[PDB]
Amino acid sequence: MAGAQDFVPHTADLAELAAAAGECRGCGLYRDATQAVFGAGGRSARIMMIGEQPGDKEDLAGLPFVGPAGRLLDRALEAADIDRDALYVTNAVKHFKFTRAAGGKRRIHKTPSRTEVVACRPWLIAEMTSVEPDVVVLLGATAAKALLGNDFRVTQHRGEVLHVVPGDPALVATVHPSSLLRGPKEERESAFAGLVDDLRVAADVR
Numbered sequence: 210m211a212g213a214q215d216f217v218p219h220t221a222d223l224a225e226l227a228a229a230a231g232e233c234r235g236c237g238l239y240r241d242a243t244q245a246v247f248g249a250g251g252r253s254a255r256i257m258m259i260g261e262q263p264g265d266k267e268d269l270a271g272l273p274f275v276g277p278a279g280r281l282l283d284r285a286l287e288a289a290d291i292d293r294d295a296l297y298v299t300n301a302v303k304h305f306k307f308t309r310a311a312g313g314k315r316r317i318h319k320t321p322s323r324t325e326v327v328a329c330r331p332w333l334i335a336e337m338t339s340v341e342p343d344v345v346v347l348l349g350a351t352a353a354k355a356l357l358g359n360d361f362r363v364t365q366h367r368g369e370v371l372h373v374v375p376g377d378p379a380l381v382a383t384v385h386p387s388s389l390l391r392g393p394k395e396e397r398e399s400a401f402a403g404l405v406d407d408l409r410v411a412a413d414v415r
């Protein structure tokens with residue numbers, strides 16, 4: 210009776226789950242978005258990564274992490290010696306929440322409410338049950354709070370392996386790559402290195 214739960218089929222098959230998510234009305238976000246954007250990757254993945262939501266580019270590509278933030282993430286993964294093809298990558302909410310500004314060049318993402326996060330969480334549970342990751346990288350506040358609690362602060366736990374969640378994977382909470390796109394150069398460079406560090410922490414979990 211709550212959120213997305215009745216839309217989630219009784220299967221662990223990612224293709225079947227993704228097709229079912231296309232029909233989800235578990236919160237209001239499906240109305241204005243173009244389509245649901247499920248995770249991408251396969252069930253043998255050892256590392257799962259979770260962002261906030263599909264953004265402007267993802268909403269139309271049908272795939273996660275395809276815009277500028279995704280390209281920065283690619284650069285960090287490559288520096289961390291992680292093959293993106295070996296990951297399962299998804300988002301805490303699966304429809305893009307947005308507005309437009311006059312004269313703008315893109316649709317501007319808006320923050321999912323905690324209510325929407327909890328509504329969509331049945332999909333995330335299904336993904337985690339399906340993939341059985343050894344480690345989950347939580348990219349940004351929304352994703353980190355989705356698994357670690359609404360009071361959790363990413364900024365206060367950088368580099369730490371956390372454990373609370375299906376399968377009891379290790380959890381590593383880090384900054385979202387979109388936050389690394391802008392700011393003064395030295396700050397962006399230090400922040401990029403810290404993202405690489407946290408990805409390496411995740412990859413070194415045994």
Ligand code: SF4
Binds near residue numbers: 230236328
């Ligand atoms: S954001 Fe999640 S719960 Fe809300 S309609 Fe989309 S798939 Fe369903």
